[PDB]
């Protein structure tokens, strides 16, 4: 099957190479440090001794390194190696990082798309694994069938920085969820209530219900029509002080939840207490 | 001809409660400070009480769903002889202390008293995924739980009359985390003119659903006071600058998510970067 090369053999790059081998692709691997190659040599990979050698083995080149700086250090070490190849860069970073990297690649005669892996290394290979892609549509089309070995492809558009924007937005969502878990569990723990049962039987079911409610809020964001949905900001601005006061009586810091309470209060002070929660998005933009 | 009930407060939530009692065949008497809000309920079979006194005299099970504890006290103190030998079920949002203060007054005026927390928005009332928490004397709860089971799934959480409110405010803080995450993520995609609806339905919800299951493992680690490799705080502390920098380039404020990033960084500086997210709970206690 179609050869592939993988540059960077940390946790995610190891899993990517492993899955290409499992599906029968001739897989060439490279890493700054040689030791991380050995688990992949053990299951049939070729270890390339140089960046040049890895680039010559395949026309599809996958880069999965620490950061954009490291990607640039790899590219600049063999600047004639990239011509007429397709580079698929799965290295985490900002939208700007992806645009800057694409500029260099184009100037050196390569084709370039950026991807964001929304998945833990163990999930690689499963349909559960969402991988976002951005950059020129024709470049993606030319390699998507091979890339579909790693997970479910989701192309998100032409601007090569979009996959990173989507990735970082999803991670922001997760950091909010974790903020809520932390505050809720601290409050019950302050009254010597075990965390396990509370989370399994009360917090997860409640978060599941409100996670579905997010589709209503998203519709209201698009329509710029911030109806209350039966839960007005005026009413919420009376429950939030109670959450703060009980937290303080229990000795629990309010640092993780006070920001959104100040937003809710600001909207009431603008005269729009009869709206609902979809109004907050525009306030931080 | 089912067991009579009285409902005090006909805002969005109180309207839904009264509606459900009528739908299930109960003689339902209703009262509101602003009397016009009774008319949609008279239209579906309710009796409108002209006074607090008359609403209290119509039933033995008396439900109050107004705004805050101050409002409940204003209602109680207007007819101090009306409450004797009744069961008051107070579903009005407040702190644990508010529930204890209210119960003291009720007991002194010859009433029985339970406090509850409605974990549902109005349209959810009557469906299986509506959870209502209850606390106070177990025999008082026993006397009315079958009637109350019309609103949702009863969850008794103990005898201290303040416990339902502690549980309620903890679950609400969980939800405000989730909503902080939605708000930041949708602002990021909206800053690049991406519709909220498709992103939320096909990318954000499935991601949040996966990460929600991970919360069981974190809760176990909280109980065992044993945190963690896994996803070490050290790695998380590498995603955060990418999210902050991309937010700044897009003109999106970081006020909703910066707190958790600062907590994480404090734990790394204590020498415990190899621990996991469950360590955060103890830090805010
Ligand atoms: N909606 C949701 O998503 C629910 C989520 C879980 C439960 N949650 C709680 O349940 C109650 C009622 O909420 P609702 O949305 O109905 O509030 P409003 O629509 O603003 O109605 C407030 C009511 O409180 C009364 N209220 C307000 N102040 C008073 C006083 N002082 N005395 C008596 N009654 C009072 C007011 O009477 P009014 O219509 O303004 O005349 C209304 O009947 C409140 O404590 C909420 O925190 C709500």
Author numbering:
A (entry chain B): 3 to 287
B (entry chain A): 2 to 229, 231 to 287
Task: Please give sentences taken from the publication describing this entry.
The NADPH-dependent imine reductase from Ajellomyces dermatitidis (AdRedAm) catalyzes the reductive amination of certain ketones with amine donors supplied in an equimolar ratio. The two AdRedAm monomers associate to form a dimer in which reciprocal domain sharing results in the formation of a large active-site cleft between the N-terminal domain of one monomer and the C-terminal domain of its partner. One of them, AdRedAm from Ajellomyces dermatitidis, has been reported to be more stable than AspRedAm and thus perhaps more suitable for process applications.
The first form, which belongs to space group P3121 and was refined to 2.01 Å resolution, features two molecules (one dimer) in the asymmetric unit in complex with the redox-inactive cofactor NADPH4. Using data set 1, the structure of AdRedAm was solved using the structure of AspRedAm (sequence identity of 54%) as a model. The structure was built and refined using iterative cycles of building in Coot and refinement in REFMAC. This data set yielded two molecules in the asymmetric unit as a dimer, which is the canonical form of previously described imine reductases. Electron density for the backbone atoms was largely complete throughout the length of both chains from Ala2 to Lys288. Interestingly, the other active site featured no cofactor density. A comparison of monomers with and without NADPH4 showed that the side chain of Asn94 was rotated approximately 180° to accommodate the ribose of the cofactor, but that the orientation of the other side chains was largely conserved. The AdRedAm dimer observed in the structure from data set 1 was already instructive in showing two possible states of the monomer in which the non-natural cofactor molecule was either absent or bound.
